[PDB]
Design a protein around this ligand. Sequence first.
Ligand SMILES: Cc1cc2nc3c(=O)[nH]c(=O)nc-3n(C[C@@H](O)[C@@H](O)[C@@H](O)COP(=O)(O)OP(=O)(O)OC[C@H]3O[C@@H](n4cnc5c(N)ncnc54)[C@H](O)[C@@H]3O)c2cc1C
Ligand SMILES: Cc1cc2nc3c(=O)[nH]c(=O)nc-3n(C[C@@H](O)[C@@H](O)[C@@H](O)COP(=O)(O)OP(=O)(O)OC[C@H]3O[C@@H](n4cnc5c(N)ncnc54)[C@H](O)[C@@H]3O)c2cc1C
Lengths: 482, 482
Amino acid sequence: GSADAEYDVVVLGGGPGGYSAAFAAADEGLKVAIVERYKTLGGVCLNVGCIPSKALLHNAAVIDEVRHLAANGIKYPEPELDIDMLRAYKDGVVSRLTGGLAGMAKSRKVDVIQGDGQFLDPHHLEVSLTAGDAYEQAAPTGEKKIVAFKNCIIAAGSRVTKLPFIPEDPRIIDSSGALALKEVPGKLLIIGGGIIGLEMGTVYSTLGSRLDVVEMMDGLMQGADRDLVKVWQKQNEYRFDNIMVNTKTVAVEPKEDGVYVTFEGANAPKEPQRYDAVLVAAGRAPNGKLISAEKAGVAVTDRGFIEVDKQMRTNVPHIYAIGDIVGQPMLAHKAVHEGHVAAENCAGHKAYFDARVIPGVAYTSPEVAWVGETELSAKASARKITKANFPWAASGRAIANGCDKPFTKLIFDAETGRIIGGGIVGPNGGDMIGEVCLAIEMGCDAADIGKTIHPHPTLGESIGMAAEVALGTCTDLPPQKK
Amino acid sequence: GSADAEYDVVVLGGGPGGYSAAFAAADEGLKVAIVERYKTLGGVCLNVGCIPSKALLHNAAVIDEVRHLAANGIKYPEPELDIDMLRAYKDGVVSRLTGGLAGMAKSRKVDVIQGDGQFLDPHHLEVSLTAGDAYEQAAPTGEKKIVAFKNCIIAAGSRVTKLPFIPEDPRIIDSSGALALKEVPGKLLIIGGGIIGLEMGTVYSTLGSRLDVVEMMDGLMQGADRDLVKVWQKQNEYRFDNIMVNTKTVAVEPKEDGVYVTFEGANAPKEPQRYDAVLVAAGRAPNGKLISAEKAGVAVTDRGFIEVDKQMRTNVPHIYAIGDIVGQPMLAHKAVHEGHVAAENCAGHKAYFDARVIPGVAYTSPEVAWVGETELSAKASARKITKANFPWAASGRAIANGCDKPFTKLIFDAETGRIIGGGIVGPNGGDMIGEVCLAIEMGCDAADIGKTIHPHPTLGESIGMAAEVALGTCTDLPPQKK
Ligand SMILES: Cc1cc2nc3c(=O)[nH]c(=O)nc-3n(C[C@@H](O)[C@@H](O)[C@@H](O)COP(=O)(O)OP(=O)(O)OC[C@H]3O[C@@H](n4cnc5c(N)ncnc54)[C@H](O)[C@@H]3O)c2cc1C
Ligand SMILES: Cc1cc2nc3c(=O)[nH]c(=O)nc-3n(C[C@@H](O)[C@@H](O)[C@@H](O)COP(=O)(O)OP(=O)(O)OC[C@H]3O[C@@H](n4cnc5c(N)ncnc54)[C@H](O)[C@@H]3O)c2cc1C
C-alpha cells in the first residue's frame, strides 16, 4: 500500500515507438501502461521533431516558390513575416496531434503514467513521478510509484548529442531550440551537414538567416547517394556563405557581439567567424544507458543501444526494445513498425521485423528520398547492380512545375534483375519513394514497374519511366543502346 | 515520279499515341514515318491539353496557398497578375517540349510528314501536304504525297465535341481557346462538369473569374467515386455561383453585353443568365470516321472509334489503331502504352496491351486520383469488395500542410482479399496513385502494402495506413473492430 501497479505490458517512452507498441498490445486485449516523463505522447518526433520541422519546412517552401512565379508574370512583394503567428501555427499542428494521442490512450484504456521510469528488477519499474506540461520541461514530484509488468517494451529513444567543447549560451541551440523560433538569426552556424540541420537551415535561410554549415565528413546528407545530394546542393548553394565540409569546429567562444567560432580544415576561414547563433545538429545518442537496464538484466552497448533480435526481444526474454534506442536509422517510421512487432510478441503471436527496406528522406528543397540498395552501399558490398536514372528535364510536369533539375533513380540486382534500391531528388520525393518501396518489398523487376501504367503528366510516372529506361524502352528520351 | 514514299510503318498522328508508337518501332530498326497535319508533335496532350493545362493549374495552386499562409502569419497582398507573361510561360513549357520531340524524331531518323493523311487503299496513305507553324492552325498546300506502308498505326486521336445549338462567337470557347489566356472573363459558364473544364475552371476562378458549371449528369467528375468528389466539391464550392447539376443548357444566345444562356433543370435560374464567356467542355469525339479508313478496309464504329484487339490490331491485320481513337478512357498515359504494344507487333514481337489498370486524375485542387475497381464500378458489377479508408485528418503531414480534409481509400477483393481499386483526394494525389497502381499490378494484399515501411511524416504513407486499417492494425487511428 502506497504506489504499486501491475500490468501485462509497460511501455517505457510514449514516442512513435512506444505509443504504437502500447496501442497495439492494448489492441490485443493486453492491460498496458505508457511511462512517459513529459505530459504529451508522440515523443521527440511529434513534439520537437518530425512534425514542427516539416510544418515549418512547408511554409518556407511556399515562400520560395512565390519568389519563382514572378517570372511567370505572377507578382508578389516580400511577404510580411509574423513569427509570433508562425510559431503558434507550428505549436498548433503539434498540440492538435498531441491532444488526439492523449484522447486515443484514454479510449484504448492505456494508462499514461507521467514519470521518469527506471528498472527496479526484471519485473519492476520504479517510476519517479514528474510534473510539468511542456515537452522537455517536466520536473520530478519527489513522489514515486512501483509498476510491475509481465512484459516491458523499452522505447526510451535517443537525445541530442552534445559536443563537449561547446560552451553554454542562449545562442547555441540544438533542434528543440531552433524549433522554438525565438527569432531569425542574421547569421547562423550549423554544426553537422546531416538532414536535421540542413532541414533547420532551409527554414531559417528562407526566413532570412544567412547560414554557414560545418561537416566533418566529405559531404552533406551523409548516407544518401551523392548524385542526389549534388542536385540538392546545386539548388541551395546560394543559401550558404560557406559550405565548410571535411572541416573541424575547434573553438566556439561566445562574445557580447555574438558567438565566435573557429574551424580547422580546408576552405575553412582561418579567421574565427562570428554568428548571431549556432545550431548544433551533430547527431543523436540513444538512451539505453539511462534507464538502469542493468537492474532488469537487459544488456546495453557502450554506445548506448540495446541490440535486439528480429522479434524486438533483448537478451532478457520478456523484455523488448524498439526505436532509436535499438539502432540506426533513427526514424519515426522504423519505430512504429518495430513497435507493432514487439507488441505482437507480447500478445504471444510470433512476429519478426520482416520488412527488408526502410525509407530515408531529407524533407529539404528539393526533397532527397531513397531506399534499399544505394550505389555506395552496393559499391561497399560490391553488390553488382543496374541503375536506371530518369531525368526530370524530360518530364513535362517537372518542366511545368519548374523542377526539371531533379530525377528518379531505380537500381537493380544485376544478377536477378530485381529492384533493390530507389532514390528520388525533387518535390514530394518522400511522397513517391513508397512505390519503389512496395516494389522492393514485392521483389518487382523493371518489366514489372515499367508495364505499370503510371498517370501523366506527373512526377510519379518517372518511377515507371526509369523502369522503361531499365528496359531500354523509354520513348520520351533518346533511344537506349541503339 | 512526283510524291510517293515507302515505309515499314507509317503512324498517322504524332500525338502521345503516335510518336510513342513511332519512336518504338523506330527503336526496333523499322523504317517509320509520322504523318502529322500540324508542325509540332505531342498532339493535343502536349500542345492544347495535358501540359499547358497543368502548368497553369500549378501557378493557380501556388496563388491559392499564399492566400492560406497568412493565417500562419506569412503575409502577402494580392499578386500582380501579368497574363502576357503567364501566357508566354505556358507557351514556354510547351515549345521547350515540342522542340525536343522534333529533335528526338530527327535523332531516331523517323520522318515527320506534315500533311493531313487519308487512306488510298490498304497499303497507301494519300498525304495532302499542309502548311502552318501553330498547333491547330495548319493549311493545305494543295501539293500531295503518296506514302506506302508494310504496316500502319492509326493514332489520329479525338477532337472537341461541338454542341449543335451553341452559336459561334469569340466568347464561346473550347479548351484550346481557354488555354489561349486571351483574358480572365469576369463571369464564365462551364458547360460540362468533367475533369477538363473543372481544371479550366479552377485556373480561371483563381485568376479572377466567377464560374457557373452546368452538368447534365447527377454530379461533377463523373466516373470518380462521389466520396472523393465530395471532398473536392466541399473545398471549391466557394469558386462557383451556381453548381447547376442534372440541368440542360437550352438557349445560348450571344448579346452585345455578353453571352446569354438559358438552362433547363432544377436549382437552374429560370432567368437566362449572362456571362462574359462560356467554356464548352462537353466531351471529345474520336476521329476514326475522318481518315477514309473505309479505303483500307478498317472498320469504324458509328461513334467513331476503331475497336481493336489486345494487340492494337484492327480488323485489317497489318493495320493497328491506338489512343483516343480506339476507346475510353481517353488519356495520354493509356495512349503511350497501347503505343508501345502496336509498335512491337509491327516489329513482329507478339505484344498484348496486358496492363490490367489505368489511372484517372483530375489535377484540380485538391487532386482526385483513382484506379482499378471503384465502389460504383464494384456496385455495378456487384463485385464484393472491402474498402479501407485512411482520413488525412489523422495525418501529421496533411495537418501541417493544411490538407487534412482529404483521404486515401484502398479497395479490396472481399474473396481473394487482393487490392483491386485505389482513390486519393489531396495534393499530389496523381503522384501517389502509381503505388496503389503497381500494388494492383503485383496482385498485392493489405498485409503486402501495410507491412511496407512507408516514410513519415508524408502524404504517401496513408497508402500503408489505409492497408493497416484494412488489417484492423492502425495505431494512429481509434482501434478497429474492438
Ligand atoms: C528535429 C527532429 C526532426 C525529426 N524529423 C523526422 C522525420 O521527419 N521523419 C522521421 O522519421 N524521423 C525524424 N526524426 C526522428 C525522430 O522523430 C524519431 O526517430 C523518433 O521519434 C523515433 O521514436 P522513438 O520511439 O524511438 O523515441 P522518442 O522520440 O525519442 O520518444 C522517447 C519518449 O519516451 C520518454 N522517455 C525517455 N526516457 C524515459 C524514461 N526513463 N522514463 C520515462 N519516459 C522516458 C521521452 O520523454 C520521450 O517522449 C526527427 C528528429 C528530430 C530531433
Ligand atoms: C485540355 C486537355 C487537357 C488534357 N489533359 C490530360 C492530362 O493531364 N492527362 C492525360 O492523360 N490526358 C489528358 N487529356 C487527354 C489527351 O491529351 C490525350 O488523351 C491524347 O493526347 C492522347 O493521345 P492521342 O494519341 O491518341 O491523340 P492526339 O492528342 O489527339 O493527337 C492526334 C494528332 O495527329 C494529328 N492528326 C489527326 N488526324 C490526322 C490526319 N488525318 N492526318 C494527319 N495528322 C492527323 C493531329 O494533328 C493530332 O496532333 C487532355 C485533353 C485536353 C483536350
